[PDB]
Amino acid sequence: ADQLTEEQIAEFKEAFSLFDKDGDGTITTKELGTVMRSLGQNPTEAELQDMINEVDADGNGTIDFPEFLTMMARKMKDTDSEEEIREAFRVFDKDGNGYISAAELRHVMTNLGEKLTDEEVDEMIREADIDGDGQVNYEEFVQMMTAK
Amino acid sequence: ESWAQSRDEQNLLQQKRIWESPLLLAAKENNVQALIKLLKFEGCEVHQKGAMGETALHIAALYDNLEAAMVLMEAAPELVFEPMTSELYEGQTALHIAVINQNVNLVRALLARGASVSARATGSVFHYRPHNLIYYGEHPLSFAACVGSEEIVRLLIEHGADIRAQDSLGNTVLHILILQPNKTFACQMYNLLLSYDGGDHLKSLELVPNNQGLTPFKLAGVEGNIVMFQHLMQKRKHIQWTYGPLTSTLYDLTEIDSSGDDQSLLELIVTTKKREARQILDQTPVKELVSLKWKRYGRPYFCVLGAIYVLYIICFTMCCVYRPLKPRITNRTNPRDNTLLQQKLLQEAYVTPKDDLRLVGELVSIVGAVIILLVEIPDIFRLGVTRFFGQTILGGPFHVIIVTYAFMVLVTMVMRLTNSDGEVVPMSFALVLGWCNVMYFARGFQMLGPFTIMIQKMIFGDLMRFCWLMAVVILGFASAFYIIFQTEDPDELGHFYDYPMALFSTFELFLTIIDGPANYDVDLPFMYSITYAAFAIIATLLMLNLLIAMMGDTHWRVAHERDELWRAQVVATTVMLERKLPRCLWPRSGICGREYGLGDRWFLRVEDRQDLNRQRIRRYAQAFQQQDSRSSTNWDRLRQGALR
Amino acid sequence: ESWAQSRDEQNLLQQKRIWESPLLLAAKENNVQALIKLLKFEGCEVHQKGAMGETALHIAALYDNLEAAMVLMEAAPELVFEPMTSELYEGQTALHIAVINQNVNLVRALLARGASVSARATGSVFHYRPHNLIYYGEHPLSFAACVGSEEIVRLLIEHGADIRAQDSLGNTVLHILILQPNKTFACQMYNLLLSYDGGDHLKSLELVPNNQGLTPFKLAGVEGNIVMFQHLMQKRKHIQWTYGPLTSTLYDLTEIDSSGDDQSLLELIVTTKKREARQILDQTPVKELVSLKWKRYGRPYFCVLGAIYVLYIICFTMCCVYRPLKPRITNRTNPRDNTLLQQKLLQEAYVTPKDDLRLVGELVSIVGAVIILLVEIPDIFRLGVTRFFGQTILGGPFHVIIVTYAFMVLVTMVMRLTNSDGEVVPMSFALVLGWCNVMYFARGFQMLGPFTIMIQKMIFGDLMRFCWLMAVVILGFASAFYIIFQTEDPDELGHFYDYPMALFSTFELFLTIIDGPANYDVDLPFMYSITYAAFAIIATLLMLNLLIAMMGDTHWRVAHERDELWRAQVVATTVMLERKLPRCLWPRSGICGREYGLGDRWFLRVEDRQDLN
Amino acid sequence: VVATTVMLERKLPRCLWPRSGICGREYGLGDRWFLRVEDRQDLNRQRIRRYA
Numbered sequence A: 001a002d003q004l005t006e007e008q009i010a011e012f013k014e015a016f017s018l019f020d021k022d023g024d025g026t027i028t029t030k031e032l033g034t035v036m037r038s039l040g041q042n043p044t045e046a047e048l049q050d051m052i053n054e055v056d057a058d059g060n061g062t063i064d065f066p067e068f069l070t071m072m073a074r075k076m077k078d079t080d081s082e083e084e085i086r087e088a089f090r091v092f093d094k095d096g097n098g099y100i101s102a103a104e105l106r107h108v109m110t111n112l113g114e115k116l117t118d119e120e121v122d123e124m125i126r127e128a129d130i131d132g133d134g135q136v137n138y139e140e141f142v143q144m145m146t147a148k
Numbered sequence B: 001e002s003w004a005q006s007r008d009e010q011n012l013l014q015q016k017r018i019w020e021s022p023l024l025l026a027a028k029e030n031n032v033q034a035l036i037k038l039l040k041f042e043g044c045e046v047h048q049k050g051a052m053g054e055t056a057l058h059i060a061a062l063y064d065n066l067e068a069a070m071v072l073m074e075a076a077p078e079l080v081f082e083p084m085t086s087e088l089y090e091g092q093t094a095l096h097i098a099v100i101n102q103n104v105n106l107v108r109a110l111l112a113r114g115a116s117v118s119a120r121a122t123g124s125v126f127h128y129r130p131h132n133l134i135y136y137g138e139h140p141l142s143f144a145a146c147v148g149s150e151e152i153v154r155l156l157i158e159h160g161a162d163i164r165a166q167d168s169l170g171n172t173v174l175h176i177l178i179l180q181p182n183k184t185f186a187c188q189m190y191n192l193l194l195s196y197d198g199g200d201h202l203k204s205l206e207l208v209p210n211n212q213g214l215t216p217f218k219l220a221g222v223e224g225n226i227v228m229f230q231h232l233m234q235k236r237k238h239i240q241w242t243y244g245p246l247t248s249t250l251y252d253l254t255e256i257d258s259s260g261d262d263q264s265l266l267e268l269i270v271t272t273k274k275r276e277a278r279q280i281l282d283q284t285p286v287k288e289l290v291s292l293k294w295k296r297y298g299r300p301y302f303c304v305l306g307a308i309y310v311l312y313i314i315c316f317t318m319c320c321v322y323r324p325l326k327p328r329i330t331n332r333t334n335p336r337d338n339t340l341l342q343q344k345l346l347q348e349a350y351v352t353p354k355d356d357l358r359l360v361g362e363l364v365s366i367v368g369a370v371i372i373l374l375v376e377i378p379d380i381f382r383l384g385v386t387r388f389f390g391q392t393i394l395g396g397p398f399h400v401i402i403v404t405y406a407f408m409v410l411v412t413m414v415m416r417l418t419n420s421d422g423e424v425v426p427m428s429f430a431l432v433l434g435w436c437n438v439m440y441f442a443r444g445f446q447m448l449g450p451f452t453i454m455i456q457k458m459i460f461g462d463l464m465r466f467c468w469l470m471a472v473v474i475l476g477f478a479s480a481f482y483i484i485f486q487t488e489d490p491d492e493l494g495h496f497y498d499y500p501m502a503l504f505s506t507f508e509l510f511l512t513i514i515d516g517p518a519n520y521d522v523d524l525p526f527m528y529s530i531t532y533a534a535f536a537i538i539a540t541l542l543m544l545n546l547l548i549a550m551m552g553d554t555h556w557r558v559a560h561e562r563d564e565l566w567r568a569q570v571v572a573t574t575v576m577l578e579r580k581l582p583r584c585l586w587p588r589s590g591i592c593g594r595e596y597g598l599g600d601r602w603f604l605r606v607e608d609r610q611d612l613n614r615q616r617i618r619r620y621a622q623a624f625q626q627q628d629s630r631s632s633t634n635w636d637r638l639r640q641g642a643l644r
Numbered sequence C: 001e002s003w004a005q006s007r008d009e010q011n012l013l014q015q016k017r018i019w020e021s022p023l024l025l026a027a028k029e030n031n032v033q034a035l036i037k038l039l040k041f042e043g044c045e046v047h048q049k050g051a052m053g054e055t056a057l058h059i060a061a062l063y064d065n066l067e068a069a070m071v072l073m074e075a076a077p078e079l080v081f082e083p084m085t086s087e088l089y090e091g092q093t094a095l096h097i098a099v100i101n102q103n104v105n106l107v108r109a110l111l112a113r114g115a116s117v118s119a120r121a122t123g124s125v126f127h128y129r130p131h132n133l134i135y136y137g138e139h140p141l142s143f144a145a146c147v148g149s150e151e152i153v154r155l156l157i158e159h160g161a162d163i164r165a166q167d168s169l170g171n172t173v174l175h176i177l178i179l180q181p182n183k184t185f186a187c188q189m190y191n192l193l194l195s196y197d198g199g200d201h202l203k204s205l206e207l208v209p210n211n212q213g214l215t216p217f218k219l220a221g222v223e224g225n226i227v228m229f230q231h232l233m234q235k236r237k238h239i240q241w242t243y244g245p246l247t248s249t250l251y252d253l254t255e256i257d258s259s260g261d262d263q264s265l266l267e268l269i270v271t272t273k274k275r276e277a278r279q280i281l282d283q284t285p286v287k288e289l290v291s292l293k294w295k296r297y298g299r300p301y302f303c304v305l306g307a308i309y310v311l312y313i314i315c316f317t318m319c320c321v322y323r324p325l326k327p328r329i330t331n332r333t334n335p336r337d338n339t340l341l342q343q344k345l346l347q348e349a350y351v352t353p354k355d356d357l358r359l360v361g362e363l364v365s366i367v368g369a370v371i372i373l374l375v376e377i378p379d380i381f382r383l384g385v386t387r388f389f390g391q392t393i394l395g396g397p398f399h400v401i402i403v404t405y406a407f408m409v410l411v412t413m414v415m416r417l418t419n420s421d422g423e424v425v426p427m428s429f430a431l432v433l434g435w436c437n438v439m440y441f442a443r444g445f446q447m448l449g450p451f452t453i454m455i456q457k458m459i460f461g462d463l464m465r466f467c468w469l470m471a472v473v474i475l476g477f478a479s480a481f482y483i484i485f486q487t488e489d490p491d492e493l494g495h496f497y498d499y500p501m502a503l504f505s506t507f508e509l510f511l512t513i514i515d516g517p518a519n520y521d522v523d524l525p526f527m528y529s530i531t532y533a534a535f536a537i538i539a540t541l542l543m544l545n546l547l548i549a550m551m552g553d554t555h556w557r558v559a560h561e562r563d564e565l566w567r568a569q570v571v572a573t574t575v576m577l578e579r580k581l582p583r584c585l586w587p588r589s590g591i592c593g594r595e596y597g598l599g600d601r602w603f604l605r606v607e608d609r610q611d612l613n
Numbered sequence D: 001v002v003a004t005t006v007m008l009e010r011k012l013p014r015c016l017w018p019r020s021g022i023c024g025r026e027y028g029l030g031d032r033w034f035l036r037v038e039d040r041q042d043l044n045r046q047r048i049r050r051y052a
């Protein structure tokens, strides 16, 4: 969790917020129970407490975001390490939230030119948007830089 | 600017007095050998100064030299407390510098020897100023919790540094973290401030306003901090129930729509100048309100107040077209050029009862022009003229036309009942400012709105840089045209007879509205044709047809930001009414407490579709389970736009 | 609205009863240790209600509590049958809530204890309305088959869940899946439903239309469902042979067009409003017909119908300029300004046969105005007046000009044979409409079609946001120009001699078509120059020269919809003639059967190029 | 702009422009004219490294 960047916490926090069902900042066996029996398989109220209490460091029975982060330290994103792509993203991202959206990237090309139509911008996203939310992660942006 | 220059001379002077006085220079280059062989026998000089009155201890932290720093505390165990006696760096202690350079071992060495953890770094560079490069407050805890070294932040609390600590702006450490731009660590650290303390039950420490009276939740509305605003929204966001893809969410809404007590976050947004704060209006617990508050109430009350203005000008137009007029009072037009066969009446004509009906038509006006002055002048004393002659469009220049309107009507009232002659002139500015002030009521229309933003954004910004160009050229050719025709008849081809006509006729050939002078009965002078054709190319097909391209240059480069202006025009129209209308007819927004078991605050209910998307969460669930062509070209250029 | 606030008050009152009534709170918190104590010696209470009249089973179902519902099924085994009963929620049962929250082990429990799988979800929130978010039909099979829980789909059919099921809107379970926008599964979930269509009667479960008569093949095209349309198309596409890269395939064409009774899919496409229901024209069997129906048959009949129209308006125009006129009946130019030396005839002079040759000419153009009313009064007879004054461009405002042109000529017929003076007024509108109505035939041309839509888009869309800016600025300076020249001669420099002239003069100084009031023999009043120079800047180089950039901004930004509309302008022109021209000259498009052993469905041949090995 | 600054600098006498920057030889510096610029690192790139 130490050698992260701004684009990896701000990515994981929206992953955590969608994962935390009731929005309490913690994770129970109920809350991890709901979004796994939606995923076809059925955790039979035993792997829930086996998985959470495995990674629960302070032993409170719950998983806050840093203990969520230290499990995403061992299950971290791969060795896709760059430096120039780190710079041009903060050039691209206005508010610095790690998410370059349809409203923010349409302005960067407006500073550069060629007169993009509004529907041309949204097609630039769906080529890049792997998970399908209309916004481009840094991981979803770094594969669009070289790409071949 | 001889101030910032005077910084430099006191910074190169430090880099003279360190080449002198060798116990500084042995301290800079980490020379443990000379430091023993300058102090351990005679010494006599441990309390030296510098350009900032600093110490050798201040050098050994400013350059990361642990080794001499341990020895200087061992040799002279009294240097840790004295601050920098200076002007720029005033009050700065050696506890501060070891923090900002991340130097954990030295901080662990200074605190074990023990320094004042609440020292006042009250220097001149440290003020929140638009020229300096960092603003880190004044306290070592504030310097700790800004660079992000959270392990230091755990340590300063354990030796007793209070969170409750205000600078000259009254800011706590919570107000500081909103101001740094590299945000995204502070959200990981804002919780860590709350984890240890925040009091237990004093005020919960997030409520403490600054010297300008503002909690951190209001402060994120002014500073445009989008990440903190979502992160502070998690505290006041209550999830009610889930139903498949539907979840209903109930918001606190305590400070967002305080509805009075004019420190309101809807009030504070349309007051500021920071452009990046105006995009709070797209975050989902606020844009629900200003959709409702404007559609159910702010739309009909605005248009009804729109229609009451439309009759008022028609009540003023229909009376100005019925001035009284005497035919050619006593004179006879002698010389020339006096096609003026009427004359207005003296004030001895209110006979003929199709003239008393005029009198109510002028009396509705003069009592209508004072109610503008009864409602705009009580705005200059609460808020200065920097809102009036400031062209912040959220209540822009339509608050200075209407005041000029309410002045120009009453001048005619003084022109009447005096028998003064020229009442045409104040009445003429009364009409053209009268009708063009209905343009303000083109603000709350879905269609007519963002066109009106563009007309104002071409007056001040793309016509000013034309009219300075036009007044150069048109002063040249007019005096050139006047000289040619000075030795000519004005009877035939008389567009230029005296000089202040010769600007005005030349003003109307740059616009192609008069035809350009020509008389084929007579012989025009040979220098006219050469001069005028040279003017014809520059005026007609080189300065006007450049201006049309100039408009279309800037019309597709702000049509993402006039819609964002137009949305903020509506909210500034909405919130202005609620302060101004009496609250017998606007209900309070949302649902109150104390009838439900709620807790007296006014809540609001938002319910939305979350989509599940099946792909991103299965990627994480495989980590939760521990295991054992046109678009491509636009990204090809964007790679080539990244420029290696 | 006042209605949407009622949903707020109940859903907060729904939570208030949970803070009261301790077993419901014990049901929400999954509290089982209190629930044994609150029941197993006293109890007294079990048929509780709430704000929506639900039970503790429903509370234990809306929050995922298998343990809490376990005790409730054991305590009172008659909770599973009664539904919710309120205004918003009505008829919803605990089987429904357990389905949408994916709780497989709970649905397994409720069917074992006995739950009604035909429970009508007839509530108020469930109706297909835009102010509601999700629409899942009514039956608990539909709630499973929409969110994609295909395990529970298999679980329900084993316990007698009928596939044939219609809601209050007539929709079946296959009409529903076409309507969810987050499609993603409904290709796959479609086929699992037909995998349970093994034994039925002759109506094979897709020939069952909705309440408004629309099968799920028809519903896919009307709703703009590109993904499901091609999935349906693979069922009725027959592949004839492959030959290297040439694959010739047949298409069904039984409901693609087959324009033979009332509800052809080409008729349904160009009537709707949805932006994505118009790109079905992109897909591969439809883009062939509307080409071939137009190119061989639709194009030349449309020009003959056009070239007969121009000769009609000329025959009306050629009898318009030959009106009967007398020289100056009775008066003599009395005050001033009587530039009028003529008078029309009384209708007692049709002598001199080049005044009678016109009389056979107007009778051509007086029956031409009858036949236009006979073809458009039977158009409101079938579909309402909101088709006219709705802005549907697919046959746009060219149905309100041609009626007015028909309506204006009869007024001339009324102004004739009564001897009334003013009768240039219909004939002036008769020509400015009767010529501007040949613009309708600029439609089926390759180069002149998509220009016409741009003219139609700037009339309303980008001049109803300039005329409200024009009429304000004019109303200032026209009234201001009146006051200046009020105490002046209208003889010399007489642009403003009364106020109804004073708008008409100022309106054209805004457009820069008159020059600009100037005389140099006389001395103009000094406030004229300051006022007019501010008028010339704001109008000529700030308003008109803004509007040229206003067009050019919106010109290149929508020139991918005019090429979509123009193609759909052709299609709605094509089908308009198919239901109107009698079948002696349009054959049925395609190839029939029964000469070939085929099955009598009209077919069509398509051959393409596979470009892989 | 730069073609206008430099056109005026050599043309107006240097009793009203001064020389730009800080001179040497007052400090032990070496008689040249120096100039000072300070900027912020923007420590995002420091976090990847963190003295490694």
Ligand SMILES: [Ca+2]
Residues within 6 Å of the ligand: A019, A020, A021, A022, A025, A026, A027, A028, A031, A032
């Ligand atoms: Ca959670």
Ligand SMILES: [Ca+2]
Residues within 6 Å of the ligand: A056, A057, A058, A059, A060, A061, A062, A063, A064, A067
């Ligand atoms: Ca925990």
Ligand SMILES: [Ca+2]
Residues within 6 Å of the ligand: A093, A094, A095, A096, A097, A098, A099, A100, A101, A104
């Ligand atoms: Ca963003």
Ligand SMILES: [Ca+2]
Residues within 6 Å of the ligand: A129, A130, A131, A132, A133, A134, A135, A136, A137, A140
């Ligand atoms: Ca994404």
Ligand SMILES: [Ca+2]
Residues within 6 Å of the ligand: B514, B515, C515
């Ligand atoms: Ca002319």
